[PDB]
Every structure is written in C-alpha cells, then in structure tokens.
C-alpha cells in the first residue's frame with residue numbers, strides 16, 4: 001500500500017482492475033489482537049422453574 | 056343446621072379444662088369421671104366400636120382419620136402376640152397446647168379413655184407416650200394413675216369386669232418427630248426417633264412388633280364420654296363428616312390467647328372475636344392466620360372472614376385443620392421472618408432419615424433466610440415452590456408435608472410481598 005503512484009498506475013493498468021480498492025495484504029483496518037473481555041449468554045435451559053429434564 | 060358453634064357448658068366434654076377444680080380422684084368422681092365404666096367394659100369391643108363409629112369421631116391428632124375405623128382394624132384375633140394401645144401425648148407442634156392441658160387438668164378422663172380404648176380393641180396395656188418437657192405434667196399424671204390403681208379402676212380386674220389392664224407413662228426426650236406415630240413407636244423401643252414406612256401400619260406391626268394403635272390424647276379422652284352420652288349426641292355437633300367438639304388454641308396476636316372447647320364447624324371470626332377478644336387492633340388489623348398450627352398453610356384475612364373451622368371447609372380453603380391451633384398474625388408482622396423461623400423450626404426438628412426432608416428442609420431454610428433479607432431475585436420464588444413440590448409426597452412421614460405446606464401457603468398468598476421485598480433490596484443495596 002506504500003507503493004508509488006507510478007508503480008500503482010502501472011499495476012492498475014496491467015491488471016485491468018482497481019487493485020487499491022481490494023488489497024490482499026491486510027493493514028490497520030483489521031481487528032485488534034488484544035480484545036475486550038466477552039460475556040457470553042446462556043441457553044434457554046438455564047431456568048429455575050418448569051425446568052425438569054424429562055420435558 | 057346452618058350455623059355452628061356457641062356451645063353451652065352442659066355439653067362440654069372437657070369440664071375442668073382450666074384447672075379450677077381438683078384434678079384428683081375425689082374431684083374426678085364429682086365430675087362424671089370413672090362413672091359406669093364397668094357397663095362399658097362388660098359390653099365387649101364391638102359395641103364400643105359401634106358407638107364410636109356412630110359418633111363420627113375423626114382423628115383428633117390432625118389428619119382426621121376415622122377413629123372408629125382406625126380402632127376397628129385391631130378387631131382381630133391374636134396369634135400369640137398381645138395387642139397394645141399407645142396414647143400420643145407428645146404435642147410438639149407450635150400453636151398446639153391442648154393435650155398438655157388434658158394431661159395437667161383432666162388426667163382421670165385420659166386414664167378412663169385408656170381403659171375404654173383398651174377394651175375396645177383388646178389392647179393389653181396403655182403406653183401414654185408423654186413429652187419429655189412435660190415433667191410436672193408427667194408426675195401429675197402419675198399421681199392420678201396411682202389414684203386410679205388404688206381405687207381398683209385400672210390394674211388387676213379393672214373396674215370389676217374380669218379384664219386386666221395397665222397404664223404406663225413413657226417420657227420422651229424433647230423431640231418433635233417423636234410425635235409422629237411410627238417414630239413414637241421407635242422411641243418407645245429404645246432407639247432413635249426415626250419413622251417407619253407404611254405399610255406395615257401400626258395395627259399390623261406397631262410397638263415391639265405387636266399390633267398397636269397410636270391415638271391422640273384428645274381422641275382418647277372423649278371416647279368414654281362418647282360411650283356414656285351416646286354416639287348421636289356427640290355426632291350432632293359440627294357438619295356431616297365433621298362430628299364432635301374440638302379444643303381450639305387461639306394464640307399469636309390476640310388479646311387473650313386461650314384454649315377453648317368449641318363445636319366443630321364454628322366460624323373463625325366468631326371464635327376469635329368471642330372467645331379470644333379479637334386480634335390486637337381488631338378485625339381491621341388482622342393480616343394472616345395460620346389456621347391449625349405450624350403444619351398447615353396460612354390463609355389471609357379475606358378468606359378468614361367466612362371460613363368454618365372444621366376439616367372439610369379448610370380443605371376447601373386449600374389448607375388443613377390439623378390441631379385446630381389458630382395462630383393469629385396482625386398487620387405489623389414481617390410474615391416472611393415468621394415463616395422462615397418456622398422452617399428453621401422444621402429443620403431443627405427433623406430426624407434426618409430420608410433424603411428429601413434431610414436435605415430440602417435445610418435448603419428451604421437457607422432460601423427463606425435469604426428471602427427475609429431479600430437477598431435473591433423473583434425467579435427463586437417459584438423454584439422454591441418446586442422444592443416444596445419435591446418434598447411433598449417424596450418422604451416417609453408427613454413432616455415433609457409440614458415443612459412444604461407453609462412455604463406453599465406463603466408463596467401462594469404473598470408472592471407480591473416477596474417480589475416487592477426483593478426489588479427494594481436490589482434498589483437500596485446496589
């Protein structure tokens with residue numbers, strides 16, 4: 001993505017497509033490695049009443 | 056007959072209920088005790104059980120089982136084993152202080168009930184299983200049994216009939232579960248008070264394996280008066296299948312807590328406002344009544360307005376009569392604190408034999424101790440309901456019912472109070 005616009009114009013001419021729209025090298029747009037801590041939900045069987053197993 | 060109660064003093068069976076007369080034998084024969092008992096003994100067991108069955112006497116222990124039908128199971132020939140009557144005088148139930156009064160103030164009628172019931176089923180001896188805490192009442196009953204032996208009334212050739220009958224008094228040791236009949240039988244035999252299963256019923260295998268009838272003091276002492284006065288006289292009081300008189304115990308938040316004999320189907324409003332002086336603060340101040348002692352579900356003021364104090368109408372009021380021990384609770388009571396103290400009573404008095412009582416009564420007390428402060432959420436109310444539905448009908452004796460049913464009554468009649476308690480907990484503590 002740090003390519004000069006001469007090489008960028010040559011590359012977009014040779015491929016015939018708009019390659020700077022879709023770089024296959026990933027950059028700062030992808031997610032962060034140190035994420036906030038999650039809090040997962042619980043299922044529909046986490047109930048204290050009318051929750052017998054045979055039903 | 057449309058209304059019941061308002062019983063005159065000539066029809067009270069428990070005369071000398073308050074101890075105002077001499078309890079001894081010279082006062083007893085002045086009150087009709089031990090009078091024409093020989094003509095009750097000579098007429099065999101069948102006539103006595105017929106006069107009891109005609110009288111419609113249900114069980115005064117609290118379940119209301121037909122006492123003539125209960126004593127008629129013992130009408131069977133022996134096969135080497137003798138037969139026994141046991142008179143349950145334990146009375147460990149909160150609210151219930153009537154059989155102690157029968158022991159302390161009418162002892163000779165209890166000993167005559169032992170003799171008539173022992174002739175009625177061929178019972179050889181009478182083990183009055185008295186409570187261990189009633190020591191002065193135990194020596195009271197022993198002086199009365201000495202007066203009953205020295206006059207030839209019980210013992211060798213009892214009342215001049217050719218029938219030998221003993222009356223023993225066995226003290227307990229301070230256990231509520233020794234009032235339940237099979238743990239009572241186990242308590243006589245020298246063991247821990249742990250209940251037997253059913254079957255064998257005590258008429259098949261009772262005390263020491265002998266055929267045995269465990270009968271309450273109140274349903275024993277009225278049976279000579281049933282034999283003398285007649286079955287139809289005793290049957291004309293109360294509704295149909297609700298015959299007889301009953302020793303009510305109005306305690307709690309009333310001006311004059313009292314034990315009073317009354318006709319069976321007396322209204323509760325009539326009873327509290329006439330015989331006890333009403334609730335402290337009037338009928339306007341009444342919040343909830345535990346109708347028959349701690350084992351039965353409480354009913355609020357809206358249902359206590361019209362309800363009749365017998366077995367079947369309270370069953371229509373989704374509770375039980377029990378011991379007819381009316382506990383009265385006014386507006387200024389945190390009722391969850393009282394019910395959790397009652398469940399703490401049922402865990403301190405529970406013999407720990409089988410799984411649902413031993414674990415679930417402790418676990419309901421922990422849940423109710425959190426509910427008193429409100430340290431929970433409303434979804435744990437109905438869970439607790441299921442816990443009562445996992446104790447009621449999964450245990451051996453009916454202390455599981457007696458610890459589940461107050462929780463059911465409290466949830467069913469005060470769920471909005473529990474919900475508002477726990478939400479004001481959650482808003483003022485977070």
Ligand SMILES: NC(=O)C1=CN([C@@H]2O[C@H](COP(=O)(O)OP(=O)(O)OC[C@H]3O[C@@H](n4cnc5c(N)ncnc54)[C@H](O)[C@@H]3O)[C@@H](O)[C@H]2O)C=CC1
Pocket residue numbers: 114115116117118119120125128146147148151234235236256257258269350351375376377378452453457
């Ligand atoms: N009187 C008191 O101090 C107390 C009374 N209770 C009451 O006790 C009641 C439960 O008492 P339980 O005796 O455990 O239950 P209950 O259902 O079984 O039985 C009462 C009587 O019925 C007789 N019986 C029933 N079916 C019989 C049969 N097929 N064969 C022979 N006898 C039979 C039993 O011998 C027993 O004496 C509760 O409803 C509670 O209100 C509870 C606590 C204290």
Ligand SMILES: Cc1cc2nc3c(=O)[nH]c(=O)nc-3n(C[C@H](O)[C@H](O)[C@H](O)COP(=O)(O)O)c2cc1C
Pocket residue numbers: 113114115116117118119120122125143144145146147148231232233234235236269270271272274452453454457
């Ligand atoms: C936990 C428990 C405690 C009981 N305690 C007594 C008691 O203290 N006195 C009593 O007469 N019956 C008590 N009962 C009731 C007896 O099971 C039985 O019904 C009664 O002693 C005799 O029944 P009856 O009404 O035919 O006389 C208790 C029952 C249970 C389940």
Ligand code: SF4
Pocket residue numbers: 232249250405406407408409410411412413450451452453454455
């Ligand atoms: S349920 Fe409780 S009272 Fe009954 S046999 Fe078990 S431990 Fe005893």
